[PDB]
Amino acid sequence: ASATRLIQGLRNWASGRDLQAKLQLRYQEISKRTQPPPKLPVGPSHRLSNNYYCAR
Amino acid sequence: SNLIEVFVDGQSVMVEPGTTVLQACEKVGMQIPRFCYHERLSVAGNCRMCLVEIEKAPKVVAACAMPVMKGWNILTNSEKTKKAREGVMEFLLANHPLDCPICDQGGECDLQDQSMMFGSDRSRFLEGKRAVEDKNIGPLVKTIMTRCIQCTRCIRFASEIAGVDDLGTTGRGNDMQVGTYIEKMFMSELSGNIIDICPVGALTSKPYAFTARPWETRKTESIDVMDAVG
Ligand code: SF4
Ligand code: SF4
Ligand code: FES
């Protein structure tokens, strides 16, 4: 953004690509950093009572 | 004539009477994991690690101290063999403190090598692990009483070879302490030869204590000096 409409018309007139739409200026699409911290669980183990190392 | 047929996983070998399961397995090439046995010390069945399964045997025995009858067959890769060893390994590593950095036998442990090659991985017993106060056994041997797995190898060594006989066990059950009751220092001959015998890093060297680490030192043959025995 922050451009005049005449040079936007020239950018569309140069090639049919619609440069206003996707423009290689990532503004706020990046997720806002320092979210609340997410937990990292454990999958097919760490349940008790069966998980022998003799088996797997 | 004193040549006894035992089968290691099916393969025959002749074994003298009185010699154990373990000397048969050392004859064929096997080893059994063990703590309270030592090949040049006395024999008792304390540490329970050396359990093994015989074909047609509903009673799992400790292979360190078994008189060998004629015609056995020994499973060293079976199901409940590994189950019993992993169980005992989860037992031994409960009252042992998280000291493997600050231990001096970190490169040359035994709990570590057997817990890799024979142990489980996802532990239990979320709360506990009491600790024991130390006392200096002397100026030459640094002593932490906490890492003692109570294997009773130093004690029988003292009782049968050293003859000083000041190192026993006190208390019962969980609360068993090893070493000295009357707080008397141990300054006799071969007092440095207990750092090679203690299979965990409990009784370690005082002057050596924190100057190296075993995986960084290259070794060289040498001959004993200031003696005549070498
Ligand atoms: S003796 Fe105990 S503290 Fe030392 S390396 Fe082995 S398990 Fe760790
Ligand atoms: S001090 Fe070492 S050799 Fe003695 S019983 Fe304890 S672990 Fe075994
Ligand atoms: S070696 Fe057989 S029980 Fe310790």
The finding on whether B106 has its CB within 6 A of some atom of ligand 1 is: yes
Distance from C-alpha of B152 to C-alpha of B35, rounded to nearest angstrom: 9
Q: How was this structure determined?
A: cryo-EM
Resolution in A: 4.2
Ligand nearest to the CA of B169: 2
SS (H, E, C) B153-182: CHHHHHHHHHCCCCCEEEEECCEEEEECCC
Tell me how crowded residue A30 is: count the other CB atoms within 10 A of its CB: 7
Q: Which residues of B touch A (CB under 8 A)?
A: 79, 82-83, 86, 119-122, 124
CA B84, distance to chain mean position in Å, is: 17
Residues spanned by the domain of B42: 1-212
State the first-to-last Cα distance of chain B, in angstroms, to the nearest integer: 39
Q: What's the residue count for chain B?
A: 230
Whether ligand 2 lies within 6 angstroms of the CB of B95 is answered as: no
- Ligand 1 site, residue B199, Cβ cutoff 6 A: no
Decide whether any atom of ligand 1 lies within 6 Å of the B150 Cβ: no
Ligand 1 mutation target, pool B35, B95, B105, most atoms within 8 A of CB: B105
Let me know how long chain A is: 56
Name the residue of B146, B150, B169, B177 to mutate for ligand 2: max ligand atoms within 8 A of Cβ: B150
Give the C-alpha separation, A22 to A20, whole Å.
6
From residue B102, how far is each of B121, B199, B217 by CA, in Å?
A: 22, 16, 18
CB contact under 8 Å between A54 and B82, yes or no, is yes
Burial of B25 (0-12, 13-18, 19+ CB in 10 A): buried
Q: Which residue of chain A has the CA closest to B125?
A: A48
CB contact under 8 A, A53 and B83: no
Compute the distance between CA of residue B164 and CA of residue B205 in angstroms, rounded to an integer.
20
Determine the number of helices (DSSP H) and then strands (DSSP E) in chain B.
Answer: 4, 9
The strand pairing partners of B53, in sequence order, are B75
The count of other CB atoms within 10 Å of the CB of residue A53 is 15
Residue B99 alpha carbon, nearest atom of ligand 1: 3
Please tell me the distance between residue B100's alpha carbon and the centre of ligand 1 in angstroms: 5
Q: How many CB atoms lie within 10 A of CB B174?
A: 9
- Quote the minimal CA–CA distance from A29 to chain B in Å: 41
Inter-residue contact B83 to B96 (CB < 8 Å):
no
CB pairs under 8 A between A and B: 15
